[PDB]
Each structure stands twice: as structure tokens, then as C-alpha cells.
Amino acid sequence: PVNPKPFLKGLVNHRVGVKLKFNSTEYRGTLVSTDNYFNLQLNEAEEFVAGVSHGTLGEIFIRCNNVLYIRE
Amino acid sequence: MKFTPSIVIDAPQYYVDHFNGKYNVDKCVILRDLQLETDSESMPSSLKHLTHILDLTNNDLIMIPDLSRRDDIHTLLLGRNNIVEVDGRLLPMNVQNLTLSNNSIRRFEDLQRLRRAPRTLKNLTLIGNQVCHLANYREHVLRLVPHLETLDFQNVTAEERKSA
Amino acid sequence: DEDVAFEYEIQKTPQNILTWKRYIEYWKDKQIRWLYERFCSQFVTDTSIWEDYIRWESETSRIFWLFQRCLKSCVRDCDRICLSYLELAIEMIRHALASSLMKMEMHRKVWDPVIKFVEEKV
Amino acid sequence: VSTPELKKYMDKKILLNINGSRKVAGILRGYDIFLNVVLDDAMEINNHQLGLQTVIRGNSIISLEALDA
Amino acid sequence: NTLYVSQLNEKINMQRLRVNLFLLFATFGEVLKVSMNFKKQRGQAFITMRTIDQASLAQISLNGERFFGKPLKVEFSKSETKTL
Amino acid sequence: MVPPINCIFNFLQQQTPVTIWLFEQIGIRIKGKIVGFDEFMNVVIDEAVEIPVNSKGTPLGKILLKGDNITLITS
Amino acid sequence: IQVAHSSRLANLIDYKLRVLTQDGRVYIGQLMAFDKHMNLVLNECIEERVPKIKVEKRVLGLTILRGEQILSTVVEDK
Amino acid sequence: MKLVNFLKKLRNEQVTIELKNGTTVWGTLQSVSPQMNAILTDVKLTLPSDNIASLQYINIRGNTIRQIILPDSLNLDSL
Amino acid sequence: AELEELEEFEFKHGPMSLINDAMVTRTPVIISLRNNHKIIARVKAFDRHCNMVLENVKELWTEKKGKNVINRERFISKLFLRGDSVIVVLKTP
Amino acid sequence: NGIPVKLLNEAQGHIVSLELTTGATYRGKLVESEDSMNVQLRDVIATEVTHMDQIFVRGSQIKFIVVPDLLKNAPLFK
RNA sequence: UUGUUACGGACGGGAAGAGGAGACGUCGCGACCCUCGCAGUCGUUCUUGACUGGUCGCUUGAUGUUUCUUCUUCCCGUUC
């Protein structure tokens, strides 16, 4: 019943968790909007390098190709 | 005439020597029977174009002159020349296949430029000269030029090396 | 110096005049300009070599001097050099237009631009 | 657009060699233009079983030797 | 044009042999043939040249010349080469 | 014969157990149940647990795995 | 090295070009054909390895090169 | 629409580009394509600080070029 | 025309919106890369596939063997950074 | 259409060597060729050494495909 | 047709003494071997279809993956 793009849509204005393959760093923030090619935009972004944070970034944007997954 | 830049430019660099590499240059109207009496001047006009196979045979070249990088003239053919001495620091690693047949290399001491070959000349052959007729010449060559694999078509064996 | 080498090699043989181009494009520059001027003075009095000398010249005084140089010894490409001198003097357009009629007197459309300029001037 | 000729390899066991030093093996059931090979077996390498049928992505299938010629 | 060699050292390798041949024949004229066609070794090699004169010269001069121990038996080819 | 477009549909219908494999790290492999339907290989999967398999429980919710990053699917 | 001021891939057909690959292995070969992805058909391939100092050599192929892993081709000699 | 268009409009100007190997290579752009297939006339190379090991001509493929520099200090795209 | 023309406003709604905004009102942004890199610059142009053009480009990377961290720096300006290398961009206050 | 593809198609029933991203050099017969460069082989050797009966290869990850010296000028070009 | 745009101190090599090594392949220097010639082998029929330097040393030949863990003496070149 629940498809991917609709799930993604639902998850707008809510917390999102995303990770990368190259330089494994967990990005944590609240989602803003998405497009057909699955690029991302977050607010209140915290760059957790394997648990420990580098710094509170704020309003950020992420490309699709690097992203591993979307979680809570 | 003398080996100028214009002559080099003129030279037929179309038919590549298909045995190895590309661009088998023949300086002047024809390097075979060019009649370059002086040393090979204006080598910079070629500018390391190409084994290269710069066949400068049937000339009157007094001394062997080179001016290029480590991969610029591996299969150089200087047959039927008047090569007295071929000392130089430019062509160190490149010139492996040296066709120096029918040269004017008289003494064994004339090959002292090629001798002490561990650093002086990375590879060199030399054959068909007046120095080949001298007593214990091959042995001497073996002693000095260890890099010389093929000595006048026949190889430098282990036994030979031991002897020298 | 390679200038003496180029001059001796060019002097020992008239050898498909691009040897003067080898003396030119090596420095190309004032030495190349003087060498190409001596080349155009010595043997080659063609339109392409004079045009290359004018291209080496290419501020209105030098262009007018090159146009006076290309006015001398020009037979085949006369109307094209005439239109080129008209465009050069268009920036003494009337005197050089009469000089264009002198060098090349076929010349209807080129004279029509001077007539259009004379109409726009009024 | 053009279909890969995998009808020859139908009903034949295949020893695959996917990217990243992993030797998977299984019999071919279905195929497609993207090369997402629908195969009905999976035994990893020594040997041990981990689930029956396995559908694999097209990008991560490099080499595939047929067992039965 | 072509010159069929015979009676040479079979112990030497193919490419190397070819190279040697090339080196030898560059003094007379421009050697057209880059590699051997027969691939049998033991003397049988066809040295293809651009000019006939050059070939003739080669035949004259290198008849029974010491190349890798044995004397090479030079001779003119029966049929013309595929390249020529 | 089972084509991969209908495969997705079947998965959606059934909701079978799954063990998804990743590209970069060989050890860490995801486990859950596929739900969604899509033209691309990108599909949503509930109850995701990342297990370190030999050559033991990463906290993770209902995952949506990227279309280029799936190495294996099972049913 | 001699090479004239060429404009496009069509004008430089049938020339001995070097080719560089993603891993860093050097090639040489005469460019025979053209394609959308620059799958340049080499006339004779002499592949070369450099370990991660000095360049090695091989002589296996006379190949149809694929355009995915190519970095940048270089002209050797006409 | 696209910024390959921008690249296309540039002609006869030096630009450094850092490749996947990692070399600063200044060269003239020549006929730029929609696939970013650049061609450089004069260039400076470092085979795997930047060691000097330069060649004259080279034909670049578009997938490698990540950054470009020094066409000319000016921004214009739409026409 | 309309199939491509309707995609023009897709930047300002979706995930590129922030970058568009940045471009409009030039401000510094932190750009990351693949093989350990950190670039800082202000935005000027923008397109569909993240092939951006910037100004005042400060680079920070490492070319240190044997696990020693060395932060080298050099001023670059008016680049053309292709989208395949760009991972994360963000508008700072 | 692609000339290399055409060439490949033409060379059906010929001994063609290969090389992948990892560098596993094969050598055997060519079975079939398509628009996407998908190759299948028979009696195929493998020197990464083993001797394999058959193999199918994905087109995207191939580095280069070897062809013999026969199909050089004719009958593909003009 | 062709193009463009738009949609004395350092370093290197070789040798010796004291406390780099093993696999997988890929090309070479010797040969007691094979093989014998100018453009190879076999099927079938009076002229056509298919398939293509090998083996053994190296008595210290070259070279890419993949695991583990330097000092002294002499000789030859470059630099100050």
C-alpha cells in the first residue's frame, strides 16, 4: 500500500536521518522538500561523524547519488 | 648538405616503422644518402616526435649526437657512417637498439665513452668496425659494457662474462 | 642567436617562402616584423604576403601605412584590398575610395556603400 | 531496449561472481533488459546457505559462469 | 624486391630476430616488412624492401654474413610479396 | 517465468521477509520487509535491522533504501 | 612530437593515440572508429602498468576500447 | 537552461582543471561540446606538490573534469 | 517548450530552492567533496544538475601521507564545480 | 549507430580476448553481440588461473574487448 | 559536403659480511630440444570450408595483485 515517493512526501516537515557511503557521516535534521530525482533539503542539521558531532550547520541541502537511506 | 631544421621539417615522417613504436623519421630529403658531414645539429626541430627508429644511415656523421628524453630514439640506425666517438649525456636510457654497422671506431679506448656503462650508457651494442678486429675486443666490451646484450648479432653469454 | 641562423638558412635557398614564416611565427615580435618586411622587400611581392605583413602591422597611421604598402604591387586581389582599405579609412574615406578606384577601376556594390554613406551623411 | 540473450541459460545452474569478492550461485528463473537476474538459489562462500530465492540488481552482476554447458 | 634468407640461428626468439633483421637491412634501404609471415623460424625470413636496388645491394653484401653464429644464405624470392 | 516488474507487485501483495545487501561494507547487511511499488529499484521497506554478518543489532526504523544502493532482494 | 592544430574527433581519425584509463594504466594505438561515448577502436594495443616509479609493458590486444573508464586520449605520432 | 551552454560560448582562453588523479592542468578550451569533451593545445602535467612532466596536445573526456578555472572574470549565460 | 519550461520553477520549490536563494543573494556556503575536501565560497550562477559557479573560493584539503593532518590553503575564484562531486551545500547566516 | 558495435556484430565466431575492471583477462569464442556491449563466450580461459566452459559478461564494467587483425579495413567501413 | 548556434659531505648502482620472503599469473637471456622452409594443420572431392614461436633451465631475466615482518666495508658515477 505505502509506496516510496508518497512516504517521502509524508515525511516532509518531520525529522529525517540520512547516511553516506563515502566518508560515513550521519546527517540529522527536519525535512523541507524533495523532487523527482530524490535530492534532499534539511533544517537544523547536525553532522554526526559516527556518533560524535562536528557542528550544528542549520539549513542544508543534500544530493541523491551519495545518500544511502532515509530513516527517522 | 648540413643538417638544418628546414631539412628535418621536409623529411618524410608518414610511413611508420611497424616493428615497434611510430614515426620512423629520415632527416633531410632522405636520411639514407643525406650526406650530413658535421655532427647531428638542429635535433630540437624534431622535438622528440616518436622505438623511434631515426634511420640516419649512409651519412658522413663524425660523432653520434642526441638531444631528447628517455623515450625518444630506441631503435636508432646509423649504418655506413664515419662514427669516430659517440660520447654524450642526453640519450642515457632511450637508445637500446643501436645499429652502428660499418663505423670508424678504431681503438678500444675509443669505446671508453660507452665503457663504464653502469650509469654512463643504459644500453649500447656497436659492431662491424675496426675495433672488432683487435685482440680480446669482445671480452673488453663485455667487461666494460655489461648492458650490451647482443654483441654483433651473437649474444653476450654467461661464460663470456665470466671470462672477461 | 637564432635570427642569424634563420637569415642564413633563408638566404642560402629560396625554399617555399614559409621559411620566412618560420622566422616570423617563432618571434610571433618587432624582429619578426622587420624580418617579414625584409622578406616582402626582397623577393615576394604577392598579395597574401603583403596581407600577412599588414596583419603583423595590426593605430590608424600604421593601418594607413600598411594600406599604402598593399596598394603598391597588388594586381589580382585588387578589389578586395580596395574594400579593405575602404573599411580601414571608414573609421579620409573619400580619398582612399578614389585610391580604391585607382587601384581597381566589378566595383558597383563597393561604390554603393560609399553612396549609402553619402546619403546617411546628409 | 534490446533484450539480453539469456533464454539459452534458462533451467541451468550458474556460478556468479559479483562485485566486491563475493561468489554467489543459483539457478536462473527470470531475466530482463536491465539485467536484474531473477534466480531461485543462493549459497555463499566454506559453503553455507542463506535463504532460497534471490533477486539481484543489474549493476552488481559482473561475471556469471554456467555450470551445465 | 623481397629477399628470402636461409640458414640462420633458430634458437633466437621471433620478435628479437625480426628486430635484428631490421637493424641489419636499414643500411641498404628502407625495410618495408615489419614482422615475419611464415612463423617457422630457422632461417626462413623474407626481407621486404622499398627499392629493388637496395635489395640487390643487400644480396651482394650480406651473402654469408655472421648473424647469431651461422652464415646467412641470401637469395632473391621466387614470387612477389603481398605488400609489394 | 517471473519478470522483475511483476516481482515488485508480488512483493507488495505478500509482504515477505527480506535481507538486503549493501555495496560499500560487506559485513553490515539490512533485514526487513519490502512494501512499496515504483518504476525504479528504489522501494520502501518496514522494520529495518542492520546485522553485521560474518565474512549485532543496529537501531533503525521503517527504511527507504536508495535505488542505486540495493545489492540483493529475497522472497 | 609533431601534431597539427586539429579541431574535432572526425579530423583526427587514423592516428596513433595514447589513451589513459581510470586506474592509471597507459595505452597506445591507432584510432580507427568513432562513437557517441568515444569507444575508440585501437589498431594495436600495447598496455602498460605502473604499480602504486617505472612503466611496464604488455602485447595482447588489438582492441575495441570502451568509453566509461577513459580519462583523456593523447596524440603520439602521425 | 543548462550551464554547459556557458562553457560552449567560451573560446580561446586558459583554464586549470583538477582531474581524478589530481593535477592542475592549464589549457585552451577549443571546440567545447554538450558532453563537456574538452581539447587542450598547451598543457602542464603531473603523472602519478606538482611534479613537472608536461606534454603539448591532449583530448579530454567530460566525465573527468570536476572543476574549471580562469576563462574570464565575467558572468553571462542567457541570450 | 512547456515540458522543459515547467521544470524551470522546480528549483525554487524542491531541494534546490535554498541554493537558488543563495545564488540570488550572494552568501558563503560550505561545499564538501569525495576524497577528503572542504571548500568555502559564495554563489553566483546555477543550473539543473548542480554545476555551480561561485566567487572567493577558499579550499581546505589534505595531502599528508602516514596519518599526519596538514591543512593546505590557496585562493581560487570563479570556478565551474560539476554536480557529481558536490555532496552537501548549505546557506550560512 | 555505433561503428564499434557494428564491428563487434560482424566478428561473430572469432577468438576474442577481454578485460574487466578488476583485470580478469579472458580469451575465447564470441557467441552474440548487441547494442549494449553484452558478450557471451565458449571454451573460455581465465588468467586473473582456470579454464571455464561458458561465461556471460555485463557491458558497463568491461575495460576493453580484443579483436583479431582480419577485420581491419573491410567489409565494415565503406 | 564541412563547422557553429537555437528549438671532506650528500644521492644512486654493484659486490662481500652480520642480525626481504612465499603464492597466482603475464613477456624475455641460453638450449642438449622441437621443427626444415618464400610466402602451418585437417575435412571432403578434382579445387574449397574450419582451426592456430611450443617445451626445459635462468647457473642469482623482467613485471602487476596479494599476506607477513637494518648496519658495516670496498668499488664506480653525479652534486657542493
UniProtKB/Swiss-Prot annotation, chain A:
Any one GO MF annotation of this record: RNA binding
Intracellular or extracellular location(s): Nucleus; Cytoplasm
A GO biological-process term: spliceosomal snRNP assembly
Occurrences of domain Sm (ranges): 3-72
Domain of life: Eukaryota
GO cellular component, one term: nucleus
Keywords: Cytoplasm, mRNA processing, mRNA splicing, Nucleus, Ribonucleoprotein, RNA-binding, Spliceosome
Function: Plays a role in pre-mRNA splicing as a core component of the spliceosomal U1, U2, U4 and U5 small nuclear ribonucleoproteins (snRNPs), the building blocks of the spliceosome.
Additional information: Present with 2570 molecules/cell in log phase SD medium.
Assigned protein family: Belongs to the snRNP Sm proteins family. SmF/LSm6 subfamily.
Assembly information from the UniProt record: Component of the Sm core complex, present in spliceosomal snRNP U1, U2, U4/U6 and U5. The core complex contains SMB1, SMD1, SMD2, SMD3, SME1, SMX3 and SMX2 (Sm proteins B, D1, D2, D3, E, F and G, respectively), and is probably a heptameric ring structure. SMX3 specifically interacts with SME1.
Protein name (database record): Small nuclear ribonucleoprotein F
The organism of origin for this protein: Saccharomyces cerevisiae (strain ATCC 204508 / S288c) (Baker's yeast)
Source species taxonomy: Eukaryota, Fungi, Dikarya, Ascomycota, Saccharomycotina
Swiss-Prot record, chain B:
A GO biological process held by the record: U2-type prespliceosome assembly
GO molecular function: U2 snRNA binding
Cystine connections: none
Chief location: nucleus
Compartments in which it is found: Nucleus
GO CC field: cytoplasm; nucleus; Prp19 complex; spliceosomal complex; U2 snRNP; U2-type prespliceosome
Domain LRRCT, chain residue ranges per copy: 129-164
LRR-type repeats, residues: 51-71, 72-92, 94-115
Domain of life: Eukaryota
Swiss-Prot/TrEMBL keywords: Leucine-rich repeat, mRNA processing, mRNA splicing, Nucleus, Repeat, Spliceosome
Other comments on record: Present with 3630 molecules/cell in log phase SD medium.
Quaternary data: Belongs to the CWC complex (or CEF1-associated complex), a spliceosome sub-complex reminiscent of a late-stage spliceosome composed of the U2, U5 and U6 snRNAs and at least BUD13, BUD31, BRR2, CDC40, CEF1, CLF1, CUS1, CWC2, CWC15, CWC21, CWC22, CWC23, CWC24, CWC25, CWC27, ECM2, HSH155, IST3, ISY1, LEA1, MSL1, NTC20, PRP8, PRP9, PRP11, PRP19, PRP21, PRP22, PRP45, PRP46, SLU7, SMB1, SMD1, SMD2, SMD3, SMX2, SMX3, SNT309, SNU114, SPP2, SYF1, SYF2, RSE1 and YJU2. Interacts with MSL1.
Entry's family note: Belongs to the U2 small nuclear ribonucleoprotein A family.
Free-text function comment from the UniProt entry: Involved in pre-mRNA splicing. Associates to U2 snRNA in a MSL1 dependent manner and is required for normal accumulation of U2 snRNA. Required for the spliceosome assembly and the efficient addition of U2 snRNP onto the pre-mRNA.
Protein name (Swiss-Prot/TrEMBL): U2 small nuclear ribonucleoprotein A'
From Swiss-Prot, chain D:
RNA-binding listed as a keyword: yes
Location(s) in or outside the cell: Nucleus; Cytoplasm
Alphabetical list of InterPro entries matching this protein: Lsm7/SmG-like, LSM_dom_sf, Sm, Sm_dom_euk/arc, Sm_G
Keywords of the record: Cytoplasm, mRNA processing, mRNA splicing, Nucleus, Ribonucleoprotein, RNA-binding, Spliceosome
One GO cellular component, as annotated: nucleus
PROSITE patterns: SM
Claim: Cell cycle is one of the keywords in the record: no
GO MF annotation list: RNA binding
One of the GO biological process terms: spliceosomal complex assembly
Origin superkingdom: Eukaryota
Domain Sm: 1-69
CDD domains associated with the record: Sm_G (cd01719)
Pfam families according to UniProt: LSM
Family, per entry: Belongs to the snRNP Sm proteins family.
Biological role stated in the UniProt entry: Plays a role in pre-mRNA splicing as a core component of the spliceosomal U1, U2, U4 and U5 small nuclear ribonucleoproteins (snRNPs), the building blocks of the spliceosome.
Note: Present with 1400 molecules/cell in log phase SD medium.
Assembly notes: Component of the Sm core complex, present in spliceosomal snRNP U1, U2, U4/U6 and U5. The core complex contains SMB1, SMD1, SMD2, SMD3, SME1, SMX3 and SMX2 (Sm proteins B, D1, D2, D3, E, F and G, respectively), and is probably a heptameric ring structure. SMX2 specifically interacts with SME1.
Protein name: Small nuclear ribonucleoprotein G
Native source species: Saccharomyces cerevisiae (strain ATCC 204508 / S288c)
Lineage, highest ranks first: Eukaryota, Fungi, Dikarya, Ascomycota, Saccharomycotina
Curated annotation (Swiss-Prot), chain I:
Domain Sm: 16-93
Compartments, record wording: Nucleus; Cytoplasm, Cytosol
Primary location recorded for the protein, binned into one broad class: nucleus
Record's keyword annotation contains RNA-binding: yes
One Gene Ontology CC term in the entry: U1 snRNP
Protein keywords: Cytoplasm, mRNA processing, mRNA splicing, Nucleus, Ribonucleoprotein, RNA-binding
GO biological process, alphabetically ordered: 7-methylguanosine cap hypermethylation; mRNA 5'-splice site recognition; mRNA splicing, via spliceosome; spliceosomal complex assembly; spliceosomal snRNP assembly; U2-type prespliceosome assembly
Any GO molecular function: RNA binding
Isomerase found in the keyword field: no
Complex and partners: Component of the Sm core complex, present in spliceosomal snRNP U1, U2, U4/U6 and U5. The core complex contains SMB1, SMD1, SMD2, SMD3, SME1, SMX3 and SMX2 (Sm proteins B, D1, D2, D3, E, F and G, respectively), and is probably a heptameric ring structure.
Family the entry assigns: Belongs to the snRNP core protein family.
Comment field (misc): Present with 799 molecules/cell in log phase SD medium.
Function noted in UniProt: Plays a role in pre-mRNA splicing as a core component of the spliceosomal U1, U2, U4 and U5 small nuclear ribonucleoproteins (snRNPs), the building blocks of the spliceosome.
Protein's UniProt name: Small nuclear ribonucleoprotein Sm D2
Protein's gene: SMD2
From-to range in the entire protein, with total length: 16 to 108 of 110
